[PDB]
Design a protein around this ligand. Structure first.
Ligand SMILES: O=c1c(O)cccc2cc(O)c(O)c(O)c12
Length: 273
């Protein structure tokens, strides 16, 4: 099994061998623990072809993440149980969450218009600096948290860990996710981290190599079985290409207009609740 065929084989396997297991809502999944798939990034981009993936959402959310924004409305205006706060909730201030962890891990939070330069650990500049100072390093690792777990005195575990790897001038990425929603989150996360990989490879003078996606609880929501059953009958088409339009030097300088997908012909959108 290779390409999108891995993803399809993994859906089939969960359908055939998954065990019924409830998530935090109380809603039902078929679940399997432990899976991995590899998608080559050489001269192709793993935007799934067996349903249309919301590519623009993938990009804009990655750009907001990279900025380390905690302003909800900065993503709402692109058009794309975590209670706390009052006037800050109306305002749209999310708290020290998402990209705030990639660019300012463990900094003291003020508000979302506040100035965080040089505060907390910039995990993402660290990854890029290490790639340039020691490409052989085995610790080129960046982590994300779910906003829900972030008391964060609690030393809460990460939701995802992304490990980069460099050999022969090629940048590879392994994403480990402690849980993965195969119907909706996984196709999105594949595109998203393969995009990150293209960005980092570009500003570091490497060629993208491989994206490896590894899960803990790989699951399918009960209300995602029939549409997935039908997706399984569709034959994958050659992956599109991702072209970067100008020469970019810093991860912060990338803009949505720098990117162009080419030769993308997916099967039609599947809607999933
Ligand atoms: O606070 C941490 C945390 O809240 C969660 C997870 C991992 C950590 C890993 C570290 O190496 C570290 O120095 C930390 O300070 C943390």
């Amino acid at each position: 099994p290779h390409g999108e065929l891995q993803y399809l084989g993994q859906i089939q396997h969960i359908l055939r061998c998954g065990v019924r297991k409830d998530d935090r809502t109380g809603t039902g999944t078929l679940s399997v623990f432990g899976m991995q798939a590899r998608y080559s990034l050489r001269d192709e981009f793993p935007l799934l072809t067996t349903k249309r993936v919301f590519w623009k959402g993938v990009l804009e959310e990655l750009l907001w993440f990279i900025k380390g924004s905690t302003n909800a409305k900065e993503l709402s205006s692109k058009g794309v149980l975590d209670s706390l706060g009052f006037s800050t909730r109306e305002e749209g201030d999310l708290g020290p969450v998402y990209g705030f962890q990639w660019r300012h891990f463990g900094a003291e939070y003020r508000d979302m218009e506040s100035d965080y330069s040089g505060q907390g650990v910039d995990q993402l500049q660290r990854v890029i600096d290490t790639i340039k100072t020691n490409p052989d390093d085995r610790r080129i690792i960046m982590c994300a948290w779910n906003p829900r777990d972030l008391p964060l005195k609690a030393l809460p575990p990460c939701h995802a860990l992304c490990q980069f790897y460099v050999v022969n001038s090629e940048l590879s990425c392994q994403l480990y996710q402690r849980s993965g929603d195969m119907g909706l989150g996984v196709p999105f996360n594949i595109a998203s981290y393969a995009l990150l990989t293209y960005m980092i490879a570009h500003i570091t003078g490497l060629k993208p190599g491989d994206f490896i996606h590894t899960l803990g609880d790989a699951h399918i929501y009960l209300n995602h079985i029939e549409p997935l059953k039908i997706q399984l009958q569709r034959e994958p088409r050659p992956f599109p290409k991702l072209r970067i339009l100008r020469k970019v030097e810093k991860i912060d300088d990338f803009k949505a207009e720098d990117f162009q997908i080419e030769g993308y012909n997916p099967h039609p959108t599947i809607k999933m609740e």
